[PDB]
Design an enzyme around this catalytic site. Structure first.
Site, PDB file in Angstrom:
ATOM      1  N   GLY A  15       0.833  -1.217   0.000  1.00  0.00           N
ATOM      2  CA  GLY A  15       0.000   0.000   0.000  1.00  0.00           C
ATOM      3  C   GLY A  15       0.855   1.249   0.000  1.00  0.00           C
ATOM      4  O   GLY A  15       0.696   2.137   0.838  1.00  0.00           O
ATOM      5  N   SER A  16       1.766   1.305  -0.961  1.00  0.00           N
ATOM      6  CA  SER A  16       2.694   2.406  -1.082  1.00  0.00           C
ATOM      7  C   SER A  16       2.342   3.343  -2.240  1.00  0.00           C
ATOM      8  O   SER A  16       3.205   4.009  -2.791  1.00  0.00           O
ATOM      9  CB  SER A  16       4.083   1.832  -1.299  1.00  0.00           C
ATOM     10  OG  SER A  16       4.082   1.034  -2.474  1.00  0.00           O
ATOM     11  N   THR A  17       1.069   3.366  -2.612  1.00  0.00           N
ATOM     12  CA  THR A  17       0.557   4.225  -3.678  1.00  0.00           C
ATOM     13  C   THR A  17       0.642   5.703  -3.312  1.00  0.00           C
ATOM     14  O   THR A  17       0.789   6.552  -4.184  1.00  0.00           O
ATOM     15  CB  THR A  17      -0.913   3.918  -3.895  1.00  0.00           C
ATOM     16  OG1 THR A  17      -1.042   2.546  -4.273  1.00  0.00           O
ATOM     17  CG2 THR A  17      -1.500   4.819  -4.953  1.00  0.00           C
ATOM     18  N   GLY A  19       0.979   8.646   0.494  1.00  0.00           N
ATOM     19  CA  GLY A  19       1.367   8.873   1.876  1.00  0.00           C
ATOM     20  C   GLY A  19       2.692   8.279   2.306  1.00  0.00           C
ATOM     21  O   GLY A  19       3.642   8.211   1.518  1.00  0.00           O
ATOM     22  N   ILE A  20       2.750   7.871   3.579  1.00  0.00           N
ATOM     23  CA  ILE A  20       3.952   7.291   4.158  1.00  0.00           C
ATOM     24  C   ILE A  20       4.531   6.267   3.186  1.00  0.00           C
ATOM     25  O   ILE A  20       5.676   6.382   2.770  1.00  0.00           O
ATOM     26  CB  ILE A  20       3.640   6.505   5.431  1.00  0.00           C
ATOM     27  CG1 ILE A  20       2.756   7.286   6.444  1.00  0.00           C
ATOM     28  CG2 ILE A  20       4.930   5.918   6.009  1.00  0.00           C
ATOM     29  CD1 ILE A  20       3.397   8.468   7.239  1.00  0.00           C
ATOM     30  N   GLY A  21       3.723   5.270   2.823  1.00  0.00           N
ATOM     31  CA  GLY A  21       4.138   4.215   1.905  1.00  0.00           C
ATOM     32  C   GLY A  21       4.843   4.732   0.674  1.00  0.00           C
ATOM     33  O   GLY A  21       5.752   4.087   0.132  1.00  0.00           O
ATOM     34  N   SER A 142       0.916   3.260  14.280  1.00  0.00           N
ATOM     35  CA  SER A 142       0.566   4.634  14.531  1.00  0.00           C
ATOM     36  C   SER A 142       0.565   4.886  15.999  1.00  0.00           C
ATOM     37  O   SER A 142       0.422   3.931  16.763  1.00  0.00           O
ATOM     38  CB  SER A 142      -0.846   4.852  14.054  1.00  0.00           C
ATOM     39  OG  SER A 142      -1.395   5.909  14.798  1.00  0.00           O
ATOM     40  N   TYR A 155      -9.746   0.689  14.282  1.00  0.00           N
ATOM     41  CA  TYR A 155      -8.472   1.001  13.703  1.00  0.00           C
ATOM     42  C   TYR A 155      -7.487   0.968  14.855  1.00  0.00           C
ATOM     43  O   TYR A 155      -6.428   0.315  14.769  1.00  0.00           O
ATOM     44  CB  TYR A 155      -8.518   2.390  13.094  1.00  0.00           C
ATOM     45  CG  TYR A 155      -7.168   2.893  12.770  1.00  0.00           C
ATOM     46  CD1 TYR A 155      -6.463   2.355  11.712  1.00  0.00           C
ATOM     47  CD2 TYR A 155      -6.578   3.906  13.521  1.00  0.00           C
ATOM     48  CE1 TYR A 155      -5.203   2.801  11.391  1.00  0.00           C
ATOM     49  CE2 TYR A 155      -5.299   4.379  13.203  1.00  0.00           C
ATOM     50  CZ  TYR A 155      -4.630   3.805  12.131  1.00  0.00           C
ATOM     51  OH  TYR A 155      -3.386   4.220  11.764  1.00  0.00           O
TER      52      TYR A 155
END
Lengths: 265, 265, 265, 265
Positions: A15-17, A19-21, A142, A155
């Site tokens: 999931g590096s599409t 943000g952080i990723g 997080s 979450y």
């Protein structure tokens, strides 16, 4: 004397599409690692790889279009990409919903997406890393995993859980040079946050920089740093942990929250 | 993309005559920081500076002969070295003594040495750093601060305390770019340990490498890494934290114990 | 039906002429235990003793006028009351002073008072309890021990250090029926706190309930329970732990802060 | 003198036909509470009910045969016993399986059983308790929640997730007299554990006391108390927390493990 010896190593960033990723991927390829970018949407993956070719035109990128929140998404990848030397479990979803309102199925979704992704992947990659005594696995959680967020019970639960999973894995590496650790970022300026700040605070001619500032002071008073963390910031550490320079950290959960959690830990 | 922008910055490393403190100093000057080496014995300080000129002949070293465990030792240094951009509180002593046997005065000594050193120094350096919104302060504690060692109640107490001190300080930096954090190293191969391993395990033709190994398995079964941590290892992180690349970590206590503490933290 | 089994046991409650200390005692005498009331000033000890009997005529008390904050007060009480089955290390003392304003002197004072009182008293009593296989020692810290108070870092450190001291002590009770635990009360309605409220929110003319009310709003926004803790409520827990009933709890740190600390702990 | 004030209150103890669950119940009925005994198999529910009355003839019980590990068992018990003043989320279930051998299926099962049971039951009950301003919910986790068991990582995760769930729930009770806490029992002498001992240390012919004895030596070297915890000893604590007496404890995680976890916590 402080080289990140990670050139030639293949890193998977789930999931590096964005943000952080995305920040983590960029930094890592920037140190010559062969990054395998994963995203659910084939568009999103390509579009990301372009932003990156643009920055490091001499780079080894690999689109891994798949849904790692699904059982079949994951098994495809262990098939198609057998060797992975560095595994970043970044995939994680969320949606604010008051506790009594979270439907049942939602708890089942957030668990399959934010945990099984990690379980399923490591069930093969860690096993493999252990046989060859080398590699990293890092979980992106997080600060919620310690200080649960009021509008994301589930979450918050998934995050807290990651810690456990992370520690149990770290203990499978006894004797080797493989480290499994978890980091805990604080409030970051992703892109959903980016625009969330535009609509927020209307009626007060405010700049978006001044906006972060009052928003922190407003809804995040325990932050010492007093501003969002820029993805890059998380990326620095992730990279550090990715490097064999961090061999003394195994089974840890490091807080990178600019002060959020008021705890001597 | 991962530069340690710490050239030109002056770092103080208390009790850096040997062990971790020496490893931390070396690494830091290796990134062009002007390191101020502190030690109680004037011989020990010089002898250290030589081992270093030898490694980085183009380096800015400063002998700071003083006893930072004493009130007068500390005040001399804030006098003689007003500007410090990076402060590593490494000074810390210990001595194994069963609990009911620790004399009273010993508790007063370990507190003055392992805490007041840090209090006294920061009372001026942090104040100063806050006015200019820039700098680091890092405490070198030990995994003991969470898992107390059976034969060092008092030492264990001092460590645990550091955490508190560290967090209270981190909160004085609200708004700035100054970070105050603590790291917790596990069992390291200092020099007292080095030779402790020689005499230990006699009667069994053993190599010193094989010796570390059985010693860990023997008296430190919870270590995932299964070997001492080489000072260099701690130094890597310390340096990382020293750099402005670590601006998202403030008020944290990071474990660098190769697995020792069995806790999801 | 759950018998507290406190009759016949001797309990020393340090600094118990007031606040939580006074409550703790009351509760133990209520439960049939032999209690030794201790304060520095003879006036307060008898006054407290009068109160307690005024409520429980069949009360078993014993006045202990000594400053357990001194090496000698401790020596005296030890020589005099050799056999104590229950040691509540309640004696503690804070003062708000900004970190850079705290005099060097002050650190040693809180140290000697909030920590050595503990150490000294236990060096003697715990030793005895162990040779005898039975006993209880409980330390009264505060939520500060985990979440430091920005107004008094020195007091904060001593609370955090209690956690270490407590756990080591616990580990010494290995194989016996002696237990050592710590409790972290949150903010409570003690005369001390009562005075401070009248004192604050000036020129608003507010009855203590109204006064207490917004102090929690403004200064303890993090509390779930949303009010000051009545002293009695902490005693309840201490009494439980003092009992044999709590035999399985050993070397723990129990939070009793009405939700102050936002941590899955 | 410390009144448990349990008479008139309705307590639901999930998965309480045996072990800690059965003890918990016993204790509440002893204290005058109205208890609902719950198990999957009708046989066990009545059998357990027989035991309890056999000891307390004036016992107020109510059989609840349902598999709270299912969406429907939960729906049933909720529709049927609407008013519950005390909810003990005891239902939990482990199985030792090496991490890489754990079937994907198994994760969802423990998830649904050890977590959704909690969630579902509380989505309904806690909601009610809050509108009513009074209530208690307690989750029975285990020391695994902090120190993971190397033999079962999935069970470990669910225990760690209880900590999050518990704390969020707690935060919802803000401003009321409802409390939500969690306890982490250590290893206890439950028939389950009893069976496993006979089962292990084979061909040595050892009476359970001898059997229990070296299992703690070999497998729980870290225990201070050095023995299995008797079920009764956990009930004691749960009963205390169930009482109004524990009003100041809210959103805490109380360790009751006889010193297993080596942490100043």
């Amino acid at each position: 004397a402080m080289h990140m010896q990670l050139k030639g190593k293949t890193a998977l960033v789930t999931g590096s599409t964005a943000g952080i990723g995305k920040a983590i991927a960029t930094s890592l390829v920037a140190e010559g690692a062969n990054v395998l970018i994963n995203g659910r949407r084939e568009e999103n993956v390509n579009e990301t790889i372009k932003e990156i070719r643009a920055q490091y035109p001499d780079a080894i990128l690999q689109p891994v279009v798949a849904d790692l929140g699904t059982e079949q998404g994951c098994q495809d990848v262990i098939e198609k990409y057998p060797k992975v030397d560095i595994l970043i479990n970044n995939l994680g979803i969320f949606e604010p919903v008051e506790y009594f309102d979270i439907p049942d199925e939602d708890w089942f979704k957030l668990f399959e997406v934010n945990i099984m992704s990690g379980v399923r992947l490591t069930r093969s990659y860690l096993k493999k890393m252990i046989e060859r005594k080398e590699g990293r696995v890092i979980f992106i959680a997080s600060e919620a995993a310690i200080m649960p967020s009021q509008e994301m019970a589930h979450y918050s639960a998934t995050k807290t859980m990651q810690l456990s999973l992370s520690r149990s894995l770290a203990e499978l590496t006894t004797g080797t040079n493989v480290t499994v650790n978890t980091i805990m970022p604080g409030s970051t300026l992703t892109e959903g946050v980016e625009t969330m700040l535009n609509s927020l605070y209307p009626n007060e001619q405010l700049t978006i920089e001044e906006a972060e500032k009052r928003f922190m002071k407003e809804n995040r008073p325990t932050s010492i740093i007093q501003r969002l963390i820029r993805p890059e910031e998380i990326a620095h550490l992730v990279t550090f942990l990715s490097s064999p320079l961090s061999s003394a950290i195994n089974g840890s959960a490091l807080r990178i929250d600019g002060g959020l959690v008021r705890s001597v830990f």
